[PDB]
């Protein structure tokens, strides 16, 4: 149980695509498990993203379940990237002690998979991303009640975004992302 | 099947292997390693691509097509022969700027990019011959671009090694700790004997716990007779070596014989 991943890696594990990225700050340990399960443990992290999913996103339904115990700022969300337009999208089902909604442009309200999400958009200018330093938008769907298991009909959220001028491009990857930022905690998620 | 990781196929060693779009539609691979980039360094001037004669004009649009299907494309440098090395620390810099602006995410105004606007996802250090010449400085120089990248491995640095540990010609760059993946060849000069394959792979795995270590196998006995393992035998060996925590999958040489034998299909 001492063996773990602590540097950036990307690939497939037990049929599922997986990605772990960190800026190096603090101590973050990631571990792939059976099927589509992963776990992560971090302490005074800088910034990291982690999770299993699909190497090519789509309007698929996403099943997730597990435990998510942060001590600070952390996210649990369906997460992915699209190119042309460059988009980084979140479908947040759970988070720690910080909600980025109050610092983003509230743009609408969608209801899907048992709750109502608040939709936000935000522009990143010359910020790092999956194709280098670039300018892109962040699409957000933030659940009002925080669950640790369920299904995500990504077609619903992708429809309201396109309905509100937030169009996606060619999907890049799509995962259930446990993301931390200047915090500590632990998470164990199964993706299906 | 006992392969819990990636399936990497090596491309560009026989003209009749088909296209690059062909491999990404076979539904059997997760990563393609373009091969090779024969000569560099010895001659400070021209950098020699060698893919045995493939219609180089379509590799670019093919590189972009696979990434749309979740595939990852790697550029392999070196090989067996072709007069490659990095004589001076200056040759690594020129090789770096060649990779960054011609293949990778960098852009100049007067450089030619054989692969168009498509970007190769990383460089594979297929350093079979040569010496210990300045690949560690090239590794650090390529890895540095990852600071512009978020939530991904922007520029992946992998290596293809001898079977016996340590590889005298790659142990320098491997010590950096910057290599994401290591492919352990079972099938070229420095063959492992069958009675020491598992022990040699486990030594490589335990030495680099922060690198995903993959096993390199041939797809047909025509490539290496004393190193070939039928799919059933390879699955038995995987049942032991996949218990390593950093086991990364299998790398198959090559696309040509994987077409003829259907090796990865029976695996």
Residue numbers in the entry:
A (entry chain C): 6 to 197
B (entry chain B): 6 to 272
Original authors' sentences:
Plants have evolved xylanase inhibitor proteins as part of their defense mechanisms against phytopathogens. The rice xylanase inhibitor protein (OsXIP) is structurally similar to GH18 chitinase and homologous to wheat XIP-type inhibitor (XIP-I), which inhibits both GH10 and GH11 xylanases. Various inhibition and interaction analyses showed that OsXIP competitively inhibits the hydrolytic activity of GH11 xylanase RXyn2, but not the activity of GH10 xylanase RXyn1 from Rhizopus oryzae. Although XIP-type inhibitors share significant sequence similarity with GH18 chitinases and adopt a (β/α)8-barrel fold, they are thought to be devoid of chitinase activity because of lack of the catalytic DxDxE motif, which is completely conserved in the catalytic domains of GH18 chitinases.
Crystal structure of OsXIP in complex with RXyn2 was solved at 2.2 Å. The crystal structure of the OsXIP/RXyn2 complex showed that OsXIP, which has a (β/α)8-barrel fold, extrudes the loop between α4 and β5 (Lα4β5OsXIP) and inserts the loop into the xylotriose binding site (−3 to −1 subsite) formed by the inner β-sheet (palm) of RXyn2 jelly roll. In the OsXIP/RXyn2 complex, the cylindrical cavity formed by the palm of RXyn2 was upright and stacked on the loops at the N terminal ends of the β-strands of OsXIP. The primary contact region included the interface between Lα4β5OsXIP extruded from the (β/α)8-barrel of OsXIP and the presumed glycon binding site (subsites −3, −2, and −1) of RXyn2 formed by the palm. Residues 154 to 158 in Lα4β5OsXIP intruded into the cleft from the edge and reached to the catalytic center of RXyn2. They formed salt bridges and hydrogen bonds with several amino acid residues in the cleft. The Nη2 of Arg155OsXIP made salt bridges with Glu93RXyn2 Oε2 and Glu184RXyn2 Oε2 and hydrogen bonded to the phenolic oxygen of Tyr95RXyn2, which are highly conserved among GH11 enzymes, respectively. Of note, the electron density of a part of Lα4β5OsXIP (Arg155-Val158) was not observed in the free OsXIP structure but were clearly observed in the complex structure. The guanidyl group of Arg155 in Lα4β5OsXIP was shown to be critical for the inhibitory activity by mutational analysis. In an I-formation, the barrel axis of OsXIP and the central axis of the cylindrical cavity of RXyn2 lie on the same line within the OsXIP/RXyn2 complex.
